[PDB]
């Protein structure tokens, strides 16, 4: 016995902005501390890590729009 | 007997934002002070991790639209 | 018996902005200070790690859209 | 004795129309008849006025749609 | 005795129009006529009239839209 | 005695049209008549009058928009 398959999404969507003006964003925090201790660290099989971090960050993007997508046909016998 | 299978999907779908002006805005917290102490840390399989993290964020994105999306057609015997 | 599969996505979709002006965007912290402390470090296996990071980032892209995308078709026997 | 004057309006409006479709429009009106008379004619500075016409317009814009503005700051001793 | 002044207007406004069709018209007005009579014609200055005419326009814009603007700072002593 | 203008205008607007089809169009006005009468005529500075005319125009753009803008600083003692 036969078998038949067909796969046909069809997308004609859209994601969009527009802006005047972004202006006069100041980004001006007090001065950061950070400590941490420990004598003796072991990572063995797929570890990711951040250990000590201090971070400043100030975007600002003109037209941050983003789409995502993921098409994932499967089969067996 | 014979099998058949059609997917089709179809999408016009839109996300869409204006703005007059995003203005004067500021970003000024005061100084923040983090410690963290143990003396052995130990990580095996898959681990994700973040100790000590001090973080200043100013994001201001001028059209921060998004659209996340999946399709799965999956078959068996 | 035989089998056929077709696979025929369709994607005229489109991710976009426009901006006026991005502006006078200071970016004025003040100094941050870290310390991290351990006598012995030990990785073995896929380990990816970041210990003592201080990072100030203005990143202000004038455009900053994206399209992130993935096909999989798969089979078996 | 400082003065400061600020004038930032914003607008985001819209004059739009749709329509089927403007069918069959007929325009057949009997012809007119003019006749004019003076025997001299002196002016000076602005005038502008017709001495005798016969006007047959036909007009059918697919959305004759309009908008107009007028933005004036001012400022003297 | 300073003065400061900011002319900083924002506009994202649309004139926009939809149609089927404009279909079929008739401009079919019956033969006109015009005479028009003067001895003598002195002018001096911004004079700007007709004498006489017959006009027998027509006129279709598949989107007759328009936008007029206007946009004034003055200052003086 | 300082003096500071900013003239910072920003637009973002559209004027648009769309249209299946202009279709058919007819302009068959009667043959019309004109006849105009003066001795003599004298003309000085901004004169600008049609004397006698038969004007038979057709105008069919397939989408007739427009967009007309000023923008004036001015200045002085």
Known sequence: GSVQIVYKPVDLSKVTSKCGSLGNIHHKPGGGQVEVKSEKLDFKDRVQ???GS???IT?????????IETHKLTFRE
């Open 49 to 51: 890590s951040k250990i």
């Open 59 to 67: 975007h600002v993007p003109g037209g941050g729009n983003k789409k």
């Open 54 to 56: 201090l971070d400043n």
